[PDB]
Design a protein around this ligand. Structure first.
Ligand SMILES: Oc1c(Cl)cc(Cl)cc1-c1[nH]c(Br)c(Br)c1Br
Ligand SMILES: [Mg+2]
Length: 776
């Protein structure tokens, strides 16, 4: 058995490597150690010192040099006995403290053990290198194994969710948290791969295509939805909830992707060193010379949308090659060759739109002296160029009921062009998702495991509305963790009156959430909205308004003294300063109807669908106005979260090792920040101090049969029959607890002590068979 064979890749790649005779000498030492800060200023840089003496309330210890230092036992971070180094579940540590927990993660990390359990949930420290642990061989190992049986792995957390779906007939979710680049998306992929493989169909082998189409749906989105940021070379610029769908039997019956909050602005702007969406570079570098001809393509550096960041390629990525992967993913999903070429027309069209140069005419309004870019765009889109031109520079609006032709300046014309671009891109992306969803979902699900892959927390020199939305989302995901680990958990203990004294885990980012999406009193999004449909409002009246509501009034809010255009929100993962510029327009998300008119007329079957389909091109009307982006997204998010509350959540906490995207460099301050703000220690603490597993009194007749005074699945009393099978082995009384309608087990008694009763090789047929058919 590979898991027991020290030779296996399993053992080689997933297990702590065997310590040597020298390590054994140290492991049996009677010496004790403490984690301390050599520099009290740098509280996240720790050294190990030896405890040399102790008083009633103090330890004295040697620093890395020979100096002696004293500390209150109350304030001491004791080092766990080294036998614990590498331990797979940190709820097992004797001492649960920051340097201890970080140290354990460090030991596992140093030998490419990136997964470690922390009580109920999984921690995943990004390796930033490939590790051979996701082969079909690895899947196989994990198929069906109990969490305690196999090493920590994304596959194991996935299998558990799967088993729990089947055993409880309840929908599950894999919530994968992390700041940008921490590993959310790679782990999402593994979750799907694994589920796809473990619950996929062979059936004589000619129908498994559904599962290949599920797998293939993600490389498509990734090419249109991902881009290099300063924080991640493959940053997800949209969030996604993936439903993997199962039939009654337990097999995969389909999948459905809900996408969130595509970063439309990236298409027309990217900050230094960053990249537009992969698709633009893939196209340009991977098109046939004849496609380059039909689309009037040329190099990255020929396009304003691709040539401002100073970066057109990503180290170790071939765009020409990724392009082949995308095309193949589009084939496998079912995108017809016309559909695909339309898609690249739209991509090519966007690039040309970007090259349109507006200039000042005689008057104040703009003029288009060189129509090269305009014509190439219209050609590719199949729209009338002089109609598009007039729609760009001279859109018509109502003025009362009068029809008036605008003459936009250079600045307004450029912006409107950008708006057309972002609408184009955003609708295309939404279409791609719609197309995929329709291919994958062809069976009424019986159950699902939802996999959440959002854009992770991020901070840049300049943070705009997109970031506020991203970090608010991450803020809510974390509160969801807070809620299930601590709030719901204890509230239960209270209900069941199991004599639990409430603990405040000091983790609640509700105030921050409220500050953002609060209705009454109104939060940022509400004021943004109010201001968005106030006809005279500016970015400036907006920040003034925000300042007036929250400055020195909201503890999570800050009006900076160094700027008039920025406001600070204190998030769980840190304070973020947000630049107000353009918020109103971003929230209104306006597009001249003359542009829409111009494109509804496109001769292209895909472009026309982007503009004529009400489920793609239509906008919800919030009374007299269109629904704002803020309101719409608050609404999508609440819905997601409402769906999540109905599932049984499993948490994977991804952790970025550093900010350099380097393997083998675990930066303690970086990791500890995440460990703190994730509430990792608090999550371990609740699982240790508490009673995770609790079954109703009635159904307690479940794994427990005559392993004590004769008592089969029957009994007339419920609170009596309970204490029965337990006392036989005399299993510790304070190691469990009797509540109103349930029986709780401290830190998993079903596994800890229950290893003779259940999980045995005897106790079934061996203790019955001594005198079968031979008793005289
Ligand atoms: O309809 C839009 C318009 Cl008119 C302007 C802009 Cl900037 C974006 C979208 C958009 N983006 C995404 Br993603 C979806 Br779905 C939609 Br609709
Ligand atoms: Mg991602």
């Amino acid at each position: 058995d590979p898991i027991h064979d020290r030779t296996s890749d399993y053992h080689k790649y997933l297990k702590v490597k065997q310590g040597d005779s020298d390590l054994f000498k140290l492991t049996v030492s009677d010496k004790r150690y403490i984690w301390y800060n050599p520099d009290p200023k740098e509280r996240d840089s720790y050294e190990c010192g030896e405890i040399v003496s102790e008083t009633s309330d103090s330890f004295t210890f040697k620093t890395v040099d020979g100096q002696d230092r004293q500390v209150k036992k109350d304030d001491a971070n004791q080092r766990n006995p080294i036998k614990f180094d590498g331990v797979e579940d940190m709820s097992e540590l004797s001492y649960l403290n920051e340097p201890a927990v970080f140290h354990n993660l460090r030991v596992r990390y140093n030998q490419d053990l990136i997964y470690t359990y922390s009580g109920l949930f999984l921690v995943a420290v990004n390796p930033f290198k490939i590790i051979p642990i996701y082969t079909q061989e690895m899947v196989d190992i994990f198929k069906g194994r109990r969490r305690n049986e196999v090493a920590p792995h994304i596959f194991a957390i996935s299998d558990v969710a799967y088993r729990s779906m089947l055993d409880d007939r309840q929908n599950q979710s894999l919530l994968i948290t992390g700041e940008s680049g921490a590993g959310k998306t790679e782990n999402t992929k593994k979750v799907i791969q694994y589920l796809a493989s473990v619950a996929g169909r062979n059936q004589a082998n000619g129908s498994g295509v559904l599962e290949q189409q599920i797998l293939q749906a993600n490389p498509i989105l990734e090419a249109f939805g991902n881009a290099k940021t300063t924080r991640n070379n493959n940053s997800s610029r949209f969030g996604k909830f993936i439903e993997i769908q199962f039939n009654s039997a337990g097999f995969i019956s389909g999948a459905s992707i809900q996408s969130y909050l595509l970063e439309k602005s990236r298409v027309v702007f990217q900050s230094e060193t960053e990249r537009n969406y992969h698709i633009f570079y893939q196209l340009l570098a991977g098109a046939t010379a004849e496609e380059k001809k039909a689309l009037h393509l040329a190099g990255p550096e020929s396009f304003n949308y691709l040539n401002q960041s100073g970066c057109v390629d990503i180290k170790g990525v071939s765009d020409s090659e990724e392009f082949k992967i995308t095309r193949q993913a589009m084939d496998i999903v079912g995108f017809s060759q016309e559909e695909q070429m339309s898609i690249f027309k739209i991509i090519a069209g966007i690039l040309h739109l970007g090259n349109i140069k507006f200039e000042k005419g005689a008057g104040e309004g703009a003029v288009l002296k060189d129509k090269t870019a305009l014509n190439a765009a219209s050609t590719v889109f199949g729209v009338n160029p002089s109609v598009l031109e007039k729609a760009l520079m001279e859109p018509r609006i109502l003025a009362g009921r009068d029809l008036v032709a605008q003459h936009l300046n250079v600045e307004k014309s450029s912006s409107s062009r950008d708006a057309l671009v972002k609408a184009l891109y955003g609708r295309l992306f939404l279409w791609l998702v719609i197309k995929i969803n329709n291919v994958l979902c062809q069976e009424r699900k019986a159950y699902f495991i939802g996999v959440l892959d959002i854009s992770g927390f991020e901070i840049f020199k300049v943070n705009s509305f997109e970031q506020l939305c991203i970090n608010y989302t991450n803020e809510k995901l974390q509160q969801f963790f807070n809620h299930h680990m601590f709030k719901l958990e204890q509230e239960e203990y209270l209900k069941e009156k199991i004599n639990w004294t409430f603990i405040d885990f000091g983790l609640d980012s509700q105030a921050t959430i409220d500050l953002i999406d609060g209705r009454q009193p109104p939060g940022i999004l509400a004021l943004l909205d109010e201001q968005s449909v106030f006809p005279n409002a500016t970015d400036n009246t907006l920040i003034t308004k925000l300042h007036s509501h929250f400055s020195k009034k909201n503890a999570k809010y800050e009006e900076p003294r160094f700027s008039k255009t920025e406001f600070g929100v204190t998030h769980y993962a840190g304070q973020v300063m947000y630049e107000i510029q353009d918020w109103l327009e971003k929230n209104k998300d306006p597009l001249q109807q003359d542009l829409e008119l111009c494109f509804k007329d496109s001769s292209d079957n895909v472009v026309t669908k982007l503009f004529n389909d009400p489920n793609i091109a239509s906008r919800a009307k919030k009374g007299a106005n269109f629904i704002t982006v803020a309101a719409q997204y608050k609404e999508q998010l609440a819905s997601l979260m409402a769906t999540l509350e109905t599932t049984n959540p499993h948490f994977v906490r991804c952790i970025i090792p550093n900010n350099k995207q380097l393997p083998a460099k675990l930066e303690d301050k970086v990791v500890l920040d995440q460990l703190r703000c994730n509430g990792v220690l608090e999550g371990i603490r609740i699982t240790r101090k508490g009673f995770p597993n609790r079954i109703i009194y009635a159904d307690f007749v479940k794994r427990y049969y005559l392993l004590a005074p004769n008592v089969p699945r029957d009994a007339e009393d419920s609170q009596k029959a309970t204490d029965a099978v337990l006392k036989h082995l005399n299993i510790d009384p304070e190691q469990y607890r009797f509540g109103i309608t349930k029986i709780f087990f401290r830190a998993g008694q079903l596994a800890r002590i229950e290893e003779a009763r259940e999980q045995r090789l005897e106790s079934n047929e061996p203790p019955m068979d001594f005198d079968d058919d031979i008793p005289f």
